[PDB]
Coordinates of all heavy atoms in Angstrom, one line a residue:
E184 N 191.2 112.6 177.5 CA 191.0 112.9 176.1 C 189.4 113.0 175.9 O 188.7 112.0 176.3 CB 191.6 111.9 175.2 CG 191.3 112.2 173.7 CD 190.7 111.0 173.0 OE1 190.4 110.0 173.5 OE2 190.6 111.2 171.7
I185 N 188.9 114.1 175.4 CA 187.5 114.2 175.1 C 187.4 113.7 173.6 O 188.0 114.2 172.7 CB 187.1 115.7 175.2 CG1 187.1 116.1 176.6 CG2 185.7 115.9 174.5 CD1 186.8 117.6 176.9
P186 N 186.6 112.6 173.5 CA 186.7 111.9 172.1 C 185.9 112.8 171.1 O 185.0 113.5 171.4 CB 186.0 110.6 172.4 CG 185.0 110.9 173.5 CD 185.7 112.0 174.4
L187 N 186.4 112.6 169.9 CA 185.9 113.4 168.8 C 184.3 113.2 168.7 O 183.8 112.0 168.8 CB 186.5 112.9 167.4 CG 186.1 113.7 166.2 CD1 186.6 115.2 166.3 CD2 186.5 113.1 164.9
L188 N 183.6 114.3 168.5 CA 182.2 114.3 168.3 C 181.5 114.2 169.7 O 180.2 114.4 169.7 CB 181.7 113.3 167.4 CG 182.4 112.9 166.1 CD1 181.7 111.8 165.3 CD2 182.7 114.1 165.2
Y189 N 182.1 114.0 170.8 CA 181.5 114.0 172.1 C 181.8 115.4 172.8 O 181.5 115.5 174.0 CB 182.0 112.9 173.0 CG 181.4 111.5 172.6 CD1 182.0 110.7 171.7 CD2 180.3 111.0 173.3 CE1 181.5 109.5 171.3 CE2 179.7 109.8 172.9 CZ 180.3 109.0 172.0 OH 179.8 107.8 171.6
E190 N 182.3 116.3 172.1 CA 182.7 117.6 172.6 C 181.5 118.3 173.3 O 181.5 118.8 174.4 CB 183.3 118.5 171.6 CG 184.7 118.2 171.2 CD 184.8 117.1 170.1 OE1 183.8 116.7 169.7 OE2 186.0 116.8 169.8
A191 N 180.3 118.3 172.6 CA 179.1 118.8 173.1 C 178.7 118.1 174.4 O 178.4 118.8 175.4 CB 178.0 118.7 172.1
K192 N 178.7 116.8 174.4 CA 178.2 116.0 175.6 C 179.1 116.3 176.8 O 178.5 116.4 177.9 CB 178.3 114.5 175.3 CG 177.1 114.0 174.3 CD 175.9 113.7 175.1 CE 175.0 112.9 174.3 NZ 173.7 112.7 175.0
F193 N 180.4 116.6 176.6 CA 181.3 116.8 177.7 C 181.4 118.3 178.1 O 182.1 118.6 179.0 CB 182.7 116.3 177.3 CG 182.9 114.8 177.6 CD1 182.8 113.9 176.5 CD2 183.1 114.4 178.8 CE1 183.0 112.6 176.7 CE2 183.3 113.0 179.1 CZ 183.3 112.1 178.0
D194 N 180.6 119.1 177.6 CA 180.6 120.5 178.0 C 180.4 120.7 179.5 O 179.4 120.1 180.0 CB 179.5 121.3 177.2 CG 179.8 122.8 177.2 OD1 181.0 123.2 177.3 OD2 178.8 123.6 177.1
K195 N 181.3 121.3 180.1 CA 181.3 121.6 181.6 C 181.5 120.4 182.4 O 181.3 120.5 183.7 CB 180.0 122.4 182.0
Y196 N 181.9 119.3 181.9 CA 182.2 118.1 182.7 C 183.5 118.3 183.6 O 183.5 117.8 184.7 CB 182.2 116.8 181.9 CG 182.4 115.6 182.8 CD1 181.3 115.0 183.4 CD2 183.7 115.1 183.1 CE1 181.4 114.0 184.3 CE2 183.8 114.1 183.9 CZ 182.7 113.5 184.6 OH 182.8 112.4 185.4
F197 N 184.5 118.9 183.0 CA 185.9 118.8 183.6 C 186.2 120.0 184.5 O 185.5 121.0 184.4 CB 186.9 118.7 182.5 CG 186.8 117.3 181.8 CD1 186.1 117.1 180.7 CD2 187.5 116.3 182.4 CE1 186.0 115.8 180.1 CE2 187.5 115.0 181.8 CZ 186.7 114.8 180.7
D198 N 187.2 119.9 185.4 CA 187.6 121.0 186.2 C 188.2 122.1 185.3 O 188.0 123.3 185.6 CB 188.5 120.6 187.3 CG 187.8 119.7 188.3 OD1 186.9 120.2 189.0 OD2 188.0 118.5 188.3
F199 N 189.1 121.7 184.4 CA 189.7 122.6 183.4 C 189.7 121.9 182.1 O 189.7 120.7 182.0 CB 191.1 122.9 183.8 CG 191.2 123.7 185.1 CD1 191.4 123.1 186.3 CD2 191.0 125.1 185.1 CE1 191.4 123.8 187.5 CE2 191.1 125.9 186.2 CZ 191.3 125.2 187.4
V200 N 189.6 122.7 181.0 CA 189.7 122.2 179.7 C 190.8 122.8 178.9 O 191.1 124.0 179.0 CB 188.3 122.5 178.9 CG1 188.5 122.1 177.5 CG2 187.2 121.8 179.6
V201 N 191.6 122.0 178.3 CA 192.7 122.4 177.4 C 192.3 122.0 176.0 O 191.9 120.9 175.7 CB 194.0 121.6 177.7 CG1 195.1 122.1 176.8 CG2 194.4 121.7 179.2
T202 N 192.3 123.0 175.1 CA 192.1 122.8 173.7 C 193.4 122.8 172.9 O 194.2 123.7 173.1 CB 191.2 123.9 173.1 OG1 189.9 123.8 173.8 CG2 191.0 123.8 171.6
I203 N 193.6 121.9 172.0 CA 194.7 121.8 171.1 C 194.3 122.2 169.7 O 193.3 121.7 169.2 CB 195.3 120.4 171.0 CG1 195.3 119.7 172.4 CG2 196.7 120.4 170.4 CD1 196.0 120.5 173.5
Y204 N 194.9 123.2 169.1 CA 194.5 123.8 167.9 C 195.7 123.8 166.9 O 196.8 123.8 167.3 CB 194.0 125.2 168.1 CG 195.0 126.2 168.5 CD1 195.8 126.9 167.6 CD2 195.1 126.5 169.9 CE1 196.7 127.8 168.0 CE2 196.1 127.4 170.3 CZ 196.9 128.1 169.3 OH 197.8 129.0 169.7
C205 N 195.4 123.8 165.6 CA 196.4 124.0 164.6 C 195.6 124.3 163.3 O 194.4 124.1 163.2 CB 197.4 122.9 164.5 SG 196.7 121.4 163.8
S206 N 196.4 124.8 162.3 CA 195.8 125.2 161.1 C 195.1 124.0 160.4 O 195.5 122.8 160.6 CB 196.8 125.8 160.1 OG 197.7 124.8 159.6
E207 N 194.1 124.3 159.6 CA 193.4 123.3 158.8 C 194.4 122.6 157.8 O 194.3 121.4 157.6 CB 192.2 123.9 158.0
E208 N 195.3 123.4 157.3 CA 196.3 122.8 156.4 C 197.2 121.7 157.1 O 197.4 120.6 156.5 CB 197.2 123.9 155.8 CG 198.2 123.5 154.8 CD 198.8 124.7 154.0 OE1 198.7 125.8 154.5 OE2 199.3 124.5 152.9
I209 N 197.6 122.0 158.3 CA 198.4 121.0 159.1 C 197.5 119.8 159.4 O 197.9 118.6 159.4 CB 199.1 121.6 160.3 CG1 200.2 122.5 159.8 CG2 199.6 120.5 161.2 CD1 200.8 123.4 160.9
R210 N 196.2 120.0 159.9 CA 195.4 118.9 160.2 C 195.1 118.0 159.0 O 195.1 116.8 159.1 CB 194.0 119.4 160.8 CG 194.2 119.7 162.2 CD 193.0 120.3 162.8 NE 192.8 121.7 162.5 CZ 191.6 122.2 162.2 NH1 190.5 121.5 162.1 NH2 191.5 123.5 162.0
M211 N 195.0 118.6 157.8 CA 194.7 117.8 156.6 C 196.0 117.0 156.3 O 195.9 115.8 155.9 CB 194.3 118.6 155.4 CG 193.9 117.7 154.2 SD 192.9 118.5 153.0 CE 193.6 120.1 153.0
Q212 N 197.1 117.6 156.4 CA 198.4 116.8 156.1 C 198.5 115.7 157.1 O 198.8 114.5 156.7 CB 199.6 117.8 156.3 CG 200.9 117.2 156.2 CD 202.0 118.0 156.8 OE1 202.5 119.0 156.2 NE2 202.4 117.7 158.0
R213 N 198.3 115.9 158.4 CA 198.3 114.8 159.3 C 197.3 113.7 159.0 O 197.6 112.5 159.1 CB 198.2 115.3 160.7 CG 199.3 116.1 161.2 CD 198.9 116.7 162.5 NE 200.0 117.6 163.0 CZ 199.8 118.4 164.1 NH1 198.7 118.5 164.7 NH2 200.9 119.1 164.5
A214 N 196.1 114.1 158.7 CA 195.1 113.1 158.4 C 195.5 112.2 157.2 O 195.3 111.0 157.3 CB 193.8 113.8 158.1
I215 N 196.1 112.8 156.2 CA 196.5 112.1 155.0 C 197.6 111.1 155.4 O 197.7 110.0 154.8 CB 196.9 113.0 153.9 CG1 195.7 113.7 153.3 CG2 197.6 112.3 152.8 CD1 195.9 114.8 152.4
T216 N 198.5 111.4 156.3 CA 199.6 110.5 156.6 C 199.2 109.4 157.5 O 200.0 108.4 157.7 CB 200.8 111.3 157.3 OG1 200.3 111.9 158.5 CG2 201.3 112.3 156.3
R217 N 198.0 109.4 158.0 CA 197.5 108.3 158.8 C 196.8 107.2 158.0 O 196.2 107.5 156.9 CB 196.4 108.8 159.8 CG 197.0 109.7 160.8 CD 196.0 110.3 161.8 NE 196.6 111.3 162.6 CZ 196.0 111.9 163.6 NH1 194.7 111.7 163.8 NH2 196.6 112.8 164.4
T218 N 196.9 105.9 158.4 CA 196.4 104.8 157.6 C 194.9 104.8 157.4 O 194.4 104.0 156.6 CB 196.9 103.5 158.2 OG1 196.3 103.3 159.5 CG2 198.4 103.6 158.4
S219 N 194.2 105.5 158.3 CA 192.7 105.5 158.3 C 192.1 106.6 157.3 O 190.9 106.8 157.4 CB 192.2 105.8 159.7 OG 192.7 107.1 160.1
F220 N 192.9 107.2 156.5 CA 192.4 108.4 155.8 C 191.3 108.0 154.8 O 191.4 107.0 154.1 CB 193.5 109.2 155.0 CG 193.0 110.4 154.3 CD1 192.6 111.5 155.0 CD2 192.9 110.4 152.9 CE1 192.0 112.6 154.4 CE2 192.4 111.5 152.3 CZ 192.0 112.6 153.0
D221 N 190.2 108.8 154.9 CA 189.1 108.6 154.0 C 188.5 110.0 153.8 O 188.0 110.6 154.8 CB 188.1 107.7 154.8 CG 186.8 107.4 154.0 OD1 186.3 108.3 153.3 OD2 186.4 106.2 154.0
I222 N 188.5 110.5 152.6 CA 188.1 111.9 152.4 C 186.6 112.1 152.7 O 186.3 113.2 153.2 CB 188.4 112.3 150.9 CG1 188.1 113.8 150.7 CG2 187.6 111.5 149.9 CD1 188.8 114.8 151.6
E223 N 185.8 111.1 152.5 CA 184.4 111.3 152.9 C 184.2 111.4 154.4 O 183.5 112.2 154.8 CB 183.6 110.1 152.3 CG 183.7 109.9 150.8 CD 182.8 108.8 150.3 OE1 181.9 108.4 151.1 OE2 182.9 108.4 149.1

């Protein structure tokens, strides 16, 4: 797992890169359902 915000640092580190994507609406829904949610 490439940790959040280290994406730039890890550029070209791996043999292959898989990106997981989904709509902003689904990401926001998932964020809200987690106990760590903080809008700021």
